[PDB]
């Protein structure tokens, strides 16, 4: 079909090379590649782009970010960006993200916690509206007023505004928020992940599975489930289901997950694999279980969740509920850092987590294997401030790629700005023999190993200010030299890059203050020259 | 539908109320509107987006920005963003910019000074390539390697690479660079503005006009033409012309402007108006003429330029040639800040200039005549660093709008980032009576006066953390208030709506100065509102 990717393949999560004989790792360190960002920046000073939501299906992908105006305030939340696009081939091994349709919402009504679900050549956006024109001092739970938007690759834009009565709730909620993590569409049913407080308790038996707590009790568990904030109402998680084959306004149903399996109802992401027929469930830890809440969710009655222990990363938060905290405590704090599953049962994962323990700073890309971190790479710097992070991986031209959008603070004129990063995960599983024990394969074929292209290590001549200069271009740095000696003899680049590269790779920390000349009359001196129009 | 904007028309012509009885100004203060930026940001921490080029024709607009990689270095210049799009109507008075086709160049060859020119349903891009695999210590003319890219609204892409011999040069150049300011397409001919050093001097006296200089000499004028940095080669300006509808590779011709009219050859912008049939020419001042170099180019078989004196803004520069030197000195420095003409003969102009004297900081939007500044507004802060600025104005639904893309520094992860700003210029011409003596008109009708919509002055109830509270949203600030029952209806439980308390609360909120609303209890009717700052527990800010 048109307006759809082709070389895009879901990860073969059967890539579980377990057993002590085989060890999984990365062959080539991931490198951030430059491409036109599908997340357009803000143009009004003060208005910040935040809360990114990215979903990838087997046909198209969808993206959404909220533009909080009036100095990055959560009270002017009516301006959003909703886009549907597709990955594409541009004649190279680099997947090129393409935006085909975009729906820039600019109405006045405040829509918060806008999540996205990429479907079959279409996308659904779930937001909620808490603003109300009337007020009653008596107890009067306002309609959740959630809006479901519908954007197709053909430019079609539709939307429905629901009330509390139209939606089928199994239990009465006090407030309903969409999890900023992406929804998922399977078959004819779109499922979104929601979280909210219930008016009355249900099981009163919290998750109460302490990861590494020495002293804990059940009362602490069920007390943390109903924090002091939100009015001591149990924060539970639920699934919103509505069918795409419905005429006009879709019918909505809500199935609330039992509080015994969900530790704390908060934001989270739903991912589904056609290769596995499994819906992996990520749940952001906004309470005490700072260790990542990954699990495998089972559709259809009876709905079942299998939580998986992750002890390689964590989410920063305020004391006493920051990283390294393992005991149940009444607290609401944390950050959204999802973990994309790279195994059939979350055996291996790829994520962009905040390395700090308390302050939400230092974004770091990392591949984990539940026990440790297989590999790691800092996004920018250690002092970099960050916010929500989302990560989604795919396969393009028999190579595993990943796109990770992270909120970064500050910005050029705003407080936050979600920026995407495309990188290659050269997954390699090798034995004790030091050799690759197995080559990961898929339906399209065996995944290729190595870099998509050889590193650029060239040397050329460049004219600046009517003067020619030798240029050594290496992946670690580019240095210009000035030719300073001789119509009797002419020359070209010939083979001077490699002899210069050999000495330039060793004296790289010294920035090569000397230059080994040639036997001929030619010679060059290392000087830094710049254009006259931009001194910078 | 079609792939062009509707209800968009050019300005000028009617803006001729230059009579001393009538003064021209702005009615409503310009406000930056939020829209999805058609300048996509960078995704690599090392590569920085820079050198924006924006062109707007009578059908579509074109944009281009260069991604300098390897730590924002001007040596890794192979990535470029080329886009063609259109304005559109979304049921509002706001001009919504729409990007139709985008061509992300990612070759390895270094292309510097990439200029764009919009026209009909397509756009042309002119870049140069100074990289050469060959080299000669003796003086040899390098291949021009001019690359002309071609992008249509249907996604069609084409490109040509030229040679020093294929192009028709009236004089032998040593180096040729495209002016970052946008080109223009008239009829079937695409005109770009180029600048460069000549191998041999034409030996013509410079512009040699004195912007209020007590002492200047003829030789001082000729010194700036041939600076020491470029090897005493006269920096001249020329026009590259190539015709569309040509077979295969289009033929390129170069017409060098005489050094008598052009003071110093550097970057510049060409803008042509269908209503006026004139090509207004901006020239970036990179020498001593710190005053903005605006002029009116005519396409006559004899090339002719008439420069218009502007004494309202200037460009920051080094100590010998700053924004206040204005007298002939041998120097090469400055910044690109073009001025979009709002008059038939550059009578009024709109720009975003750097208000500082030396450092390229403090970007400031300003509308000027030929002597002073009509109105001014800083973009963000005074300490904001900036770079190149480009500005293009138009009409949408009988309203004067302007888009200004300026380089801002620093960025989120790069050194530079071009960001656009959309604002409305409420041009009003009136006399001392104080009543509007002139209503600006156009082909579609009289340009409407006033703000595009009434300012948002709303009040509403919002529930956060299961707690309802008042929210007063005004254009100056948004304040939440805790609702409390001041014995209303002789019962604690009550029902109140927005329209019953919003208008007087808005009146009281506008009177209270900043830092007073978040501490002042607002009591009205039978309800007490207490300014309390509360946010959701998900994200603390
Ligand atoms: C999750 O992923 C992490 C990634 O670090 C794994 O943690 C490491 O696991 C390894 C075992 O797989 C631990 O032991 C290390 O083994 C190396 C040798 O491994 C085999 O391979 C070589 C050939 O490739 C053979 O020569 C050798 O006999 C082994 O059969 C050693 O190299 C490591 O330590 C030494 O390395 C060099 C010398 O090569 C020395 O200079 C170093 O100083 C060092 O002494 C090491 O012994 C390793 O310790 C684990 N690291 C951590 C941080 O825990 C997890 O196992 C994995 N979890 C899973 C899969 O469940
Ligand atoms: C080129 O642009 C300049 C800026 O637009 C023009 O300057 C303006 O010229 C008019 C001519 O009438 C002056 O109008 C008079 O101004 C005074 C004062 O008005 C207010 O402004 C001053 C600012 O210093 C302030 O001190 C006062 O308190 C007032 O608030 C009135 O008394 C008169 O009635 C009359 O309107 C403008 O003042 C003047 N503006 C500035 C900033 O100098 C200039 O005329 C243009 N040139 C041409 C040839 O058109
Ligand atoms: C302003 O007032 C005068 C009073 O004589 C009047 O004649 C004129 O028409 C009015 N309007 C103008 C000058 O635009």
Size of interface A-B (CB pairs under 8 A): 250
Chain B residue with CA closest to A413: the answer is: B380
Compare CB distances from A419 to B108, B413, B462 and report the shortest one's residue. Answer: B413
Nearest protein CA to atom 10 of ligand 2, as residue: B23
| Residue B72 with chain A: CB contacts under 8 Å | 536
Q: Which residues contact A88 (CB under 8 A, 6 or more apart)?
A: A5, A95, A96, A97, A98
Strand B173-178, strand B79-88: pairing? unpaired
The residue written with tokens 């049962």 in the block is A345
| Residue B415 with chain A: CB contacts under 8 Å | 536
A350 has a chain B CB within 8 A of its CB = no
Give the C-alpha separation, B498 to B489, whole Å: 17
Chain A residue with CA closest to B485: the answer is: A137
Q: Is A91 left (phi over 0), alpha (psi -120 to 50) or beta?
A: left
Specify the 3-state DSSP secondary structure of A113.
Answer: strand
Q: Which residues contact B335 (CB under 8 A, 6 or more apart)?
A: B284, B315, B316, B317, B354, B360, B387, B388
Give the DSSP letter of residue A230: G
Contact A406, A421 (CB under 8 A): yes
Compare CB distances from B35 to A104, A267, A413 and report the shortest one's residue. Answer: A104
Compute CA distances B191 → A171, A414, B184, B346, B372, whole Å: 69, 38, 6, 20, 32
What per-residue string of b and e applies to B238-250 under the rule 16 or more CB within 10 Å gives b?
bbbbbeeeeeeeb
Give the DSSP letter of residue B488: G
End-to-end Cα separation, chain A, in angstroms: 48
Q: What is the resolution of this structure in A?
A: 3.5
Best residue in B77, B134, B137 to probe A by mutation, most A CBs within 10 Å? B137
Q: Is B212 left (phi over 0), alpha (psi -120 to 50) or beta?
A: left
CATH 2.60.120.1440 fits B8-438, yes or no: no
The residue written with tokens 């020498």 in the block is B287
Nearest protein CA to atom 8 of ligand 3, as residue: B433
Nearest CA-CA partner of B44 in A422, A73, A429: A422
User: B376 C-alpha to center of ligand 3: Å?
Assistant: 29
| Residue B200 with chain A: CB contacts under 8 Å | none
The closest ligand to the CA of B439 turns out to be: 3
Could you give the angle at the alpha carbon of B471 between the alpha carbons of B467 and B475, nearest 5°? 155
Give the C-alpha separation, B365 to B354, whole Å: 9
Give the C-alpha separation, A444 to A448, whole Å: 11
Compare CB distances from B496 to A135, A411, A478 and report the shortest one's residue. Answer: A135
Q: Is B7 left (phi over 0), alpha (psi -120 to 50) or beta?
A: left
Experimental technique: X-ray
Cite the beta strand spans of A363-487 per DSSP E.
363-368, 373-378, 385-396, 400-409, 417-424, 427-431, 436-438, 458-464, 467-473, 478-483
Alpha carbon of A276: minimum distance to chain B alpha carbons (Å) = 31
Give the C-alpha separation, B209 to B262, whole Å: 11
Contact A87, A420 (CB under 8 A): no
Give the DSSP letter of residue A446: B
Residue B246 backbone phi and psi in degrees, to 5 = -90, 155
Best residue in A31, A32, A41, A164 to probe B by mutation, most B CBs within 10 Å? A41
Length of chain B measured in residues: 541
The distance of Cα B219 from the centroid of its chain, to the nearest Å, equals: 36
Give the C-alpha separation, A187 to A119, whole Å: 9
The closest ligand to the CA of A432 turns out to be: 1
Nearest CA-CA partner of B54 in B146, B148, B123, B137: B123
Compute CA distances A317 → A285, A314, A335, A405, B451, whole Å: 10, 10, 7, 21, 45
Residue A101 backbone phi and psi in degrees, to 5 = -130, 145
Nearest CA-CA partner of B230 in A513, A529, A104: A529
B138 has a chain A CB within 8 A of its CB = yes
Contact A127, A111 (CB under 8 A): yes
Give the C-alpha separation, B102 to A98, whole Å: 9
Alpha carbon of A444: minimum distance to chain B alpha carbons (Å) = 27
Hey, which residues does B134 pair with through a beta bridge? Answer: A492
Contact A427, A400 (CB under 8 A): yes
| Residue B94 with chain A: CB contacts under 8 Å | 106
Strand B467-473, strand A134-136: pairing? unpaired
Best residue among B23, B347, B366, B371 to mutate for probing ligand 2's pocket (most ligand atoms within 8 Å of CB) is B23
Chain A residue with CA closest to B142: the answer is: A463
Hey, which residues does A269 pair with through a beta bridge? Answer: A282
Compute CA distances A143 → A146, A164, A261, B338, whole Å: 8, 4, 27, 53
B30 has a chain A CB within 8 A of its CB = no
| Residue A466 with chain B: CB contacts under 8 Å | 174-175, 197, 230-231, 233
Token code pair at residue B378: 């800083």
Q: Which residues contact B312 (CB under 8 A, 6 or more apart)?
A: B366, B368, B369, B370, B371, B372, B373
The closest ligand to the CA of B435 turns out to be: 3
Residue A320 preceded by cis peptide, ω within 30: yes
Could you give the angle at the alpha carbon of A508 between the alpha carbons of A506 and A513, nearest 5°? 105
Largest CA distance in chain B: 99
Best residue among A23, A24, A366 to mutate for probing ligand 1's pocket (most ligand atoms within 8 Å of CB) is A23
Length of chain A measured in residues: 536
Nearest protein CA to atom 16 of ligand 1, as residue: A432
Ligand 2 atom closest to residue B371's alpha carbon, by position in its atom list: 1
Token code pair at residue B37: 């930026």
| Residue B33 with chain A: CB contacts under 8 Å | 43-44
B453 has a chain A CB within 8 A of its CB = no
Alpha carbon of A93: minimum distance to chain B alpha carbons (Å) = 13
Strand A467-473, strand A478-483: pairing? antiparallel
| Residue B456 with chain A: CB contacts under 8 Å | 108
Give the C-alpha separation, B433 to B411, whole Å: 48
Alpha carbon of A23: minimum distance to chain B alpha carbons (Å) = 31
Alpha carbon of A197: minimum distance to chain B alpha carbons (Å) = 9
Give the C-alpha separation, B287 to B207, whole Å: 12
Nearest protein CA to atom 53 of ligand 1, as residue: A372
Give the DSSP letter of residue B308: E
Write the DSSP string, A254-276.
Answer: EEEPPTTT-SS---EEEEEETTT
A462 has a chain B CB within 8 A of its CB = yes
Give the C-alpha separation, A280 to A273, whole Å: 8
Specify the 3-state DSSP secondary structure of B220.
Answer: helix
Helix, strand counts (H, E) of chain A: 3, 36
B463 and A43 in contact by Cβ < 8 A?
no
| Residue B411 with chain A: CB contacts under 8 Å | 411-412
Question: Cβ atoms within 10 A of the Cβ of B230, count?
Answer: 19
Give the C-alpha separation, B394 to A7, whole Å: 43
Taken in order B445, B449, B454, B456, the sign of the CA dihedral is positive
The H or E element spanning position B504 is helix B502-511
Q: Which of residues 397-416 of A touch B (CB under 8 A)?
A: 408, 410-413, 415
User: B434 C-alpha to center of ligand 3: Å?
Assistant: 9
B371 close to ligand 2 (CB < 6 Angstrom): yes
Write the DSSP string, A270-293.
Answer: EEEETTTTEEEEEE---SS--S-E
Chain A residue with CA closest to B410: the answer is: A412
Q: Is B473 left (phi over 0), alpha (psi -120 to 50) or beta?
A: beta
Long-range contacts at A301-306 (CB < 8 A, ≥ 24 apart):
A303/A239, A303/A255, A303/A257, A305/A257, A305/A261, A305/A262, A305/A281
Give the C-alpha separation, A85 to A62, whole Å: 6
User: A36 C-alpha to center of ligand 2: Å?
Assistant: 47
Give the C-alpha separation, B438 to B102, whole Å: 42
Give the C-alpha separation, B345 to B295, whole Å: 8
Q: Is A3 left (phi over 0), alpha (psi -120 to 50) or beta?
A: left
Give the C-alpha separation, A157 to A252, whole Å: 19
Locate the domains of chain B by residue range. Answer: 8-438, 458-531
The closest ligand to the CA of B24 turns out to be: 2
């Amino acid at each position: 079909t048109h307006s759809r990717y082709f070389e895009e393949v879901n990860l073969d999560s059967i890539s579980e090379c377990s057993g002590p004989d085989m060890h999984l790792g990365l062959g080539v360190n991931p490198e951030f590649i430059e491409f036109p960002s599908f997340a357009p920046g803000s143009t009004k000073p003060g208005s910040c782009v935040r809360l990114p939501s990215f979903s990838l299906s087997t046909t198209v992908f969808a993206y959404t970010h909220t533009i909080m105006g009036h100095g990055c305030s959560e009270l002017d939340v009516g301006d959003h960006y909703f886009s549907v696009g597709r990955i594409a081939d541009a004649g190279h091994e680099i997947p090129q993200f393409e935006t085909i349709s975009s729906w820039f919402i600019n109405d006045k009504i405040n829509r918060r916690s806008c999540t996205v679900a990429a479907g079959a050549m279409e996308a659904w956006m779930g937001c909620v509206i808490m603003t109300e024109t009337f007020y009653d001092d008596r107890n009067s739970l306002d309609t959740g007023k959630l809006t479901i938007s519908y954007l197709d690759v053909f430019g079609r834009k539709k939307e429905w505004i629901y009330t509390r009565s139209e939606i089928l709730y199994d239990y009465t909620y006090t407030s309903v928020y969409f999890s900023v993590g992406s929804g998922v569409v399977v078959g004819d049913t779109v499922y979104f992940l929601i979280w909210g407080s219930l008016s009355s308790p249900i099981e009163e038996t919290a998750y109460c599975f302490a990861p590494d707590c020495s002293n804990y009790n059940q009362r602490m568990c069920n007390e943390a489930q109903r924090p002091s904030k939100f009015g001591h109402r149990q924060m539970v998680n639920g699934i919103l289901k509505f069918k795409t084959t419905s005429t006009g306004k879709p019918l909505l149903s809500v199935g609330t997950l039992s509080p015994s399996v969900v530790p704390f109802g908060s934001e989270g992401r739903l991912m589904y694999s056609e290769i596995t027929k499994i819906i992996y469930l990520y749940l952001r830890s906004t309470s005490w279980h700072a260790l990542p809440l990954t699990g495998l969710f089972v559709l259809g009655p009876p709905t079942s969740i299998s939580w998986i222990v992750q002890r390689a990363v964590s989410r920063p938060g305020e004391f006493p509920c920051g990283a390294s905290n393992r005991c149940p405590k009444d607290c609401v704090t944390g950050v959204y850092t999802d973990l994309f599953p790279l195994g059939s049962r979350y055996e291996y994962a790829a994520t962009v987590y905040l390395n700090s323990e308390t302050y939400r700073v230092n974004p770091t890309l990392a591949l984990i294997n539940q026990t440790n971190i297989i590999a790691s790479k800092k996004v920018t710097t250690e002092s970099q401030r960050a916010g929500y992070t989302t990560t989604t991986c795919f396969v393009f031209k028999l190579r595993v790629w990943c796109i990770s959008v992270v909120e970064l603070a500050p910005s050029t004129m705003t407080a936050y700005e979600p920026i995407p990063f495309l990188y290659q995960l050269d997954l390699t599983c090798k034995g004790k023999n030091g050799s690759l024990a197995m080559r990961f394969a898929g339906k399209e074929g065996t995944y290729k190993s190595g870099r998509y292209k050889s590193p650029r290590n060239e040397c050329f001549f460049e004219k600046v200010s009517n003067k020619y200069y030798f240029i050594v271009s290496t992946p670690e740095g580019i240095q210009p030299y000035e030719i300073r000696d001789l119509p009797h003899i002419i020359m070209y680049i010939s083979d001077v890059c490699a002899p210069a590269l050999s000495a330039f790779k060793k004296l790289l920390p010294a920035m090569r203050p000397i230059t080994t000349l040639t036997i001929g009359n030619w010679q060059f001196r290392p000087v830094e020259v710049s254009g006259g129009l931009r001194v910078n």
